[PDB]
Symmetry: C3
Subunit: 145 residues, 3 copies
């Protein structure tokens, strides 16, 4: 998947960014089976005051997670995954849960490309990994924490 994470500049230190990425990644790995290296977390920083809620300019505590997923999982799994992200981003960022927004969007794997390769359907990532060329496997392997 790709998790776009919209935060205010200077709200998360580099280590807090690492912590937030590891929380989102571990959650997605834990609940779906997808290997760590297929999960990207992409922080998008904007000056504080760029978020408005109901017309009121905000400080810099709001966190918006936009999660882009392959189609094919159940509503039940997706709810657990969103709740676990709320949970673990709150702990990892030391920010209260009422600041955390999480939307999941879904697309057919047939129109999703990671590492220059089309994604498999959500249960099939094991065989998929194996007919990647040598180098592709070696490269992805290095992206695991």
């Amino acid at each position: 998947p790709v998790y776009m994470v919209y935060v205010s500049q200077d709200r998360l230190t580099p280590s807090a960014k690492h912590a937030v990425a590891k929380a989102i990644t571990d959650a997605h790995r834990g609940l779906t089976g997808t290997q760590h290296f297929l999960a990207q977390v992409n922080f998008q920083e904007q000056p504080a005051g760029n978020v408005f809620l109901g017309g009121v300019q905000q400080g810099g505590d709001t966190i918006f997670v936009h999660g882009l997923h392959r189609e094919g999982r159940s509503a039940d799994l997706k709810g657990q995954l969103a709740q676990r992200i709320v949970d673990d981003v709150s702990v990892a960022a030391e920010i209260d849960r009422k600041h955390i927004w999480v939307f999941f969007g879904e697309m057919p794997a047939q129109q999703m490309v990671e590492y220059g390769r089309f994604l498999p359907q959500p249960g099939h990532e094991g065989e998929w990994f194996d007919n990647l060329s040598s180098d592709e496997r070696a490269f992805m392997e290095t992206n695991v924490d």
Copy 2:
């Protein structure tokens, strides 16, 4: 909903950001009934010259509104809401409507979290707000302009 608003750096003054947010938020409330505090406007500023139309680098005048909505509304309602955002943002920011792009994406409310809580379906915002904590309602009430 979350409205992501893609604009160039220094194109909108802070007063214009407030007026554009208010404009999007009032149109959304006026046409859907969703309470003000549930509508987020998130400005993503980039240096002018980062937008290309037909391969031709632009100045800093294009505005792309990307609305992330719950599923359940009619095509006619989304059409009126898209058009009102066009008209009202054009007025708020004093920009010709030909600079304004607006896309709506929808997701099930079941996979959509705001203020740390799962959203209801689009007609049930009343019941939903009546079963939040006292604190949660209070934090939420402060985000109305």
Copy 3:
């Protein structure tokens, strides 16, 4: 369409941004037939280190293209469009394909607005253009390269 392109700061020069924007616009136009001026490429730059793969912070090499399309095209056409974007962007940015992520999201044209006007169904771009007013057609025409 709108192509959101997430790249690291100072990884693409002005000229490289242009080439990547031309690669995408040409790939889209070749394969779909949509006029050049209807294809927006919108570069979102963030400091290097804001991208985490498997929870591993990246340099500034990763590119994520998020395509926002009208519904109505075949899975095979979109597979050819995604592959050609990956290929052409690889040459134009001088970046290995293993760094390129491409996702397509689709929405009904009835909730999609470009240049302040609702988009037509795919394939209906020609007739659509002529019942635009003279000045709208004229502003649009200037965005071809």
